[PDB]
Amino acid sequence: RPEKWVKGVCRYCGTGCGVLVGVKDGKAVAIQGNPNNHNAGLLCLKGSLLIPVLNSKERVTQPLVRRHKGGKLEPVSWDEALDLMASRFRSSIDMYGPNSVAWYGSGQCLTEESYVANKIFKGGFGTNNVDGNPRLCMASAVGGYVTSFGKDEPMGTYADIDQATCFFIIGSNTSEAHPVLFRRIARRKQVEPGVKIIVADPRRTNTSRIADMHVAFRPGTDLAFMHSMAWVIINEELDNPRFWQRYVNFMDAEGKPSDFEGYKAFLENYRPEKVAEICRVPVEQIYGAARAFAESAATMSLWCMGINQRVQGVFANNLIHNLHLITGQICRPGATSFSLTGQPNACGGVRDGGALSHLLPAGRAIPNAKHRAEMEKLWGLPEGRIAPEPGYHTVALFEALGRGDVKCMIICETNPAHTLPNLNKVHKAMSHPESFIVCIEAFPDAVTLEYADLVLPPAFWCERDGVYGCGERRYSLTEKAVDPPGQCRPTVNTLVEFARRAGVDPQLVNFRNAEDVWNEWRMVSKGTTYDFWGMTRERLRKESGLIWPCPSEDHPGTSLRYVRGQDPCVPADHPDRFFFYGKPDGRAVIWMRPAKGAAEEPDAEYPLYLTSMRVIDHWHTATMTGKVPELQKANPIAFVEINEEDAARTGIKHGDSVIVETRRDAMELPARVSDVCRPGLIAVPFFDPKKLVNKLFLDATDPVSREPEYKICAARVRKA
Ligand SMILES: Nc1nc2c(c(=O)[nH]1)N[C@H]1C(S)=C(S)[C@@H](COP(=O)(O)OP(=O)(O)OC[C@H]3O[C@@H](n4cnc5c(=O)[nH]c(N)nc54)[C@H](O)[C@@H]3O)O[C@H]1N2
Ligand SMILES: Nc1nc2c(c(=O)[nH]1)N[C@H]1C(S)=C(S)[C@@H](COP(=O)(O)OP(=O)(O)OC[C@H]3O[C@@H](n4cnc5c(=O)[nH]c(N)nc54)[C@H](O)[C@@H]3O)O[C@H]1N2
Ligand code: SF4
Ligand SMILES: [Mo]
């Protein structure tokens, strides 16, 4: 049994379960749920089996160098490693200017690592080449929220699940991707059997088995589906005029102001009978979906990659918001429009802290001259040091690296050789013989390390302290539970030593530890609509998370954003009960987004939709969950899901080896034949480093958020 229990957060999903880590003689021996965090002491199996990961010996414990392109990683000292790193970076800026260097990070870094990296790069080096994996994930949700509400992140919280009466769950396999969360939704329907659940997803997954209605639409036709719901809502007088006349503005197909009648006329392009043919669904599912959504006392939408990993991701996020805006199912307990975040710290670390190429900390933006002044002042910089132009977004970043525009790059806590789309093209880029790539990486089996020129050994997870901000705006702290192995070091300290050594002004990285950097970041937030000044380390050790806005030490935090008398940002004497203060007139915005499709659509030559998905037993590239023997008893290897009736008609039997082929590559997989995939669709997981499916996917990006469309491309299938 454990001697003591150290409070933290699950290293996995954006559910952000609180965790308590039992240790004895400086060794983690047991894990349980934080009874006081939102998850109430529960953890899925992945969480429950984190100790063998934490305890694994197959770990990167010394710095390593690759002397030459295509050589072996050999041991180097931290001292030699650091000097190398700083000299290359500095020399590169010296020769070619700061846009020759870049940071590529992740919503798995602690908020403090991403904050310090973001600062070193944007303020130290003078480049906005800071990006990271949430570009590939949540950037559509950010676009959707900013264009609809004028501020990022949901206005609701997980606690809204306990109070919803209808759940519209689209582009989300909640059961496999947010298991504790899916249980809270399951529990809700079980408490109140009257609750309706609508699961919209081209696949039929476990998630749908608690659903009253499963809408298995044709990939890429969900926009049309959601306009059509709106048509049914307005047509049957189920909308909420008192809400929308006061709190909403309308924008037409061209983004010019419009009105309710324009909305009405625009929708006439999206009648149920027409849209049912397009979506390939019975028409009664549209009426069904729209009525459930609108007649329910409280409606909550939840969505994830099926909506965001899409050239039309921003628009699809807008369409989900339109449903809530036209009904006023929002700013109310149980009624809210709630984007699910995948990673544990995409929200806290990358979106809120602004660690993307076009962003600045705490809701500020690169193009915005006043915002840069705000930051030069806060970071004590000279005037005009923050570059006025966005850096490379992710796909354009690795394209930059391929042309040699970006010469030096740090990849931190991500596996881009495994997880970027269009891998053959990326791999060529990562092989630029004149590039210098530094991987900060814990597990030696990450495929990306095959490209590293230098590899640094980080402290993993609760081998050091730091903050995670999950999908519901909870900031939760993880304390230090064990010493890291070998020569592993907290990345926070690594970054500082890196910046001092590369000539960055040391006023800029004046941090001994994560506590220091958290205190400055509290300051940078103060008086913005993200203010978490009230979240001192003292409170975060005592509490199992606080939810922002949280502007002072006696503030409990905020459940409902935009609501008078619940969100400190809304003036007590604001004339009305709601205030979408992210728009200049306090009104949220319904957008008339034309419904299109995928960037690569099926045709005679490639007749099938290919999609890619999450599996419950493996987390992403499986460098962690793959260390846990019991997590292989279901899914050891990649497979392709094929539809029963597509299989019948083309002679494919279950278990059979087939080639899946797209324009970009071809690859053999055992076929798992069923009704999971609707007809015309095939699906693949991406956990297998021996089957790198991103070789198959195209690269095409939403033009506004620059998210890739991993969810749809055109494939064909053939018996091997
Ligand atoms: N076990 C496990 N859990 C995880 C993760 C993990 O790796 N493993 N990773 C975390 C992260 S970072 C993320 S981003 C989340 C992802 O969580 P999810 O987005 O919930 O999981 P996905 O399987 O990527 O996609 C969800 C569904 O979107 C569907 N979809 C495909 N095409 C379309 C379409 O045209 N429209 C719509 N509406 N839907 C479509 C797919 O069929 C898929 O079933 O999971 C998080 N949690
Ligand atoms: N085809 C397809 N591809 C996708 C998606 C999809 O739906 N389809 N989903 C996308 C989405 S939403 C996401 S979030 C991305 C995720 O893609 P990635 O972030 O590339 O996947 P992970 O396996 O989480 O990589 C995390 C890495 O961090 C390393 N690591 C763990 N702990 C530490 C630490 O303390 N320090 C350091 N330095 N490293 C550490 C792990 O060993 C691992 O190599 O994948 C994207 N890729
Ligand atoms: S649902 Fe996510 S945060 Fe909760 S224990 Fe499971 S993997 Fe971890
Ligand atoms: Mo993600």
mmCIF file of C-alpha atoms and ligand atoms in Angstrom, residues 11 108 133 136-137 305 309 343 413-416 419 440-443 446 458-461 464 612 614 619-621 623-624 686 694 697 710-711, ligand 2:
data_model
loop_
_atom_site.group_PDB
_atom_site.id
_atom_site.type_symbol
_atom_site.label_atom_id
_atom_site.label_comp_id
_atom_site.label_asym_id
_atom_site.label_seq_id
_atom_site.Cartn_x
_atom_site.Cartn_y
_atom_site.Cartn_z
ATOM 1 C CA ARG A 11 -2.162 12.304 -18.769
ATOM 2 C CA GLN A 108 0.165 17.807 -24.016
ATOM 3 C CA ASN A 133 -0.716 19.818 -32.805
ATOM 4 C CA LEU A 136 -4.738 19.592 -36.266
ATOM 5 C CA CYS A 137 -7.550 19.228 -33.789
ATOM 6 C CA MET A 305 -13.185 15.579 -34.887
ATOM 7 C CA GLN A 309 -11.009 17.724 -39.121
ATOM 8 C CA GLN A 343 -5.968 16.610 -25.614
ATOM 9 C CA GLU A 413 5.616 16.226 -26.954
ATOM 10 C CA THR A 414 4.202 15.249 -30.382
ATOM 11 C CA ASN A 415 4.936 12.642 -33.043
ATOM 12 C CA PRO A 416 4.504 14.504 -36.410
ATOM 13 C CA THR A 419 0.442 12.145 -37.082
ATOM 14 C CA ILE A 440 12.124 16.707 -26.678
ATOM 15 C CA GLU A 441 10.678 13.233 -26.299
ATOM 16 C CA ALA A 442 10.126 10.666 -23.546
ATOM 17 C CA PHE A 443 9.834 7.363 -25.344
ATOM 18 C CA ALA A 446 8.383 7.565 -31.335
ATOM 19 C CA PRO A 458 12.147 15.329 -20.457
ATOM 20 C CA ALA A 459 10.612 14.664 -17.120
ATOM 21 C CA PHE A 460 7.379 12.727 -17.901
ATOM 22 C CA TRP A 461 3.962 13.645 -16.574
ATOM 23 C CA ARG A 464 7.421 17.379 -12.411
ATOM 24 C CA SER A 612 -9.786 7.737 -39.651
ATOM 25 C CA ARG A 614 -9.977 6.838 -32.424
ATOM 26 C CA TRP A 619 -3.886 6.826 -27.254
ATOM 27 C CA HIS A 620 -2.652 8.353 -30.534
ATOM 28 C CA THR A 621 0.755 6.972 -31.649
ATOM 29 C CA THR A 623 4.186 5.128 -27.383
ATOM 30 C CA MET A 624 2.513 5.123 -23.940
ATOM 31 C CA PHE A 686 -3.899 5.512 -36.715
ATOM 32 C CA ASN A 694 -1.511 9.270 -42.707
ATOM 33 C CA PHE A 697 -4.645 10.976 -46.297
ATOM 34 C CA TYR A 710 -8.129 13.839 -41.845
ATOM 35 C CA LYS A 711 -11.755 12.671 -41.791
HETATM 36 N N1 LIG B 2 -5.186 10.248 -39.585
HETATM 37 C C1 LIG B 2 -5.410 11.008 -38.467
HETATM 38 N N2 LIG B 2 -4.376 11.633 -37.870
HETATM 39 C C2 LIG B 2 -4.510 12.437 -36.792
HETATM 40 C C3 LIG B 2 -5.822 12.561 -36.190
HETATM 41 C C4 LIG B 2 -6.901 11.824 -36.855
HETATM 42 O O1 LIG B 2 -8.055 11.924 -36.402
HETATM 43 N N3 LIG B 2 -6.643 11.105 -37.971
HETATM 44 N N4 LIG B 2 -5.987 13.310 -35.082
HETATM 45 C C5 LIG B 2 -5.108 14.459 -34.845
HETATM 46 C C6 LIG B 2 -5.279 15.010 -33.446
HETATM 47 S S1 LIG B 2 -6.801 15.611 -32.905
HETATM 48 C C7 LIG B 2 -4.230 15.056 -32.624
HETATM 49 S S2 LIG B 2 -4.419 15.642 -31.066
HETATM 50 C C8 LIG B 2 -2.877 14.586 -33.042
HETATM 51 C C9 LIG B 2 -2.113 13.887 -31.961
HETATM 52 O O2 LIG B 2 -0.855 13.516 -32.563
HETATM 53 P P1 LIG B 2 0.482 13.436 -31.676
HETATM 54 O O3 LIG B 2 0.473 14.500 -30.593
HETATM 55 O O4 LIG B 2 1.665 13.334 -32.633
HETATM 56 O O5 LIG B 2 0.293 11.962 -30.986
HETATM 57 P P2 LIG B 2 0.821 11.433 -29.554
HETATM 58 O O6 LIG B 2 0.956 9.939 -29.654
HETATM 59 O O7 LIG B 2 0.078 12.070 -28.352
HETATM 60 O O8 LIG B 2 2.306 12.013 -29.368
HETATM 61 C C10 LIG B 2 2.701 12.462 -28.061
HETATM 62 C C11 LIG B 2 4.195 12.224 -27.971
HETATM 63 O O9 LIG B 2 4.671 12.805 -26.777
HETATM 64 C C12 LIG B 2 5.652 11.937 -26.209
HETATM 65 N N5 LIG B 2 5.688 12.311 -24.785
HETATM 66 C C13 LIG B 2 4.935 11.828 -23.788
HETATM 67 N N6 LIG B 2 5.217 12.433 -22.615
HETATM 68 C C14 LIG B 2 6.168 13.340 -22.854
HETATM 69 C C15 LIG B 2 6.924 14.325 -22.055
HETATM 70 O O10 LIG B 2 6.774 14.516 -20.826
HETATM 71 N N7 LIG B 2 7.809 15.041 -22.709
HETATM 72 C C16 LIG B 2 8.019 14.917 -24.019
HETATM 73 N N8 LIG B 2 8.938 15.746 -24.532
HETATM 74 N N9 LIG B 2 7.391 14.056 -24.838
HETATM 75 C C17 LIG B 2 6.466 13.254 -24.296
HETATM 76 C C18 LIG B 2 5.071 10.572 -26.481
HETATM 77 O O11 LIG B 2 6.026 9.531 -26.368
HETATM 78 C C19 LIG B 2 4.594 10.759 -27.898
HETATM 79 O O12 LIG B 2 5.691 10.500 -28.779
HETATM 80 O O13 LIG B 2 -3.023 13.572 -34.005
HETATM 81 C C20 LIG B 2 -3.644 14.090 -35.164
HETATM 82 N N10 LIG B 2 -3.464 13.092 -36.221
#
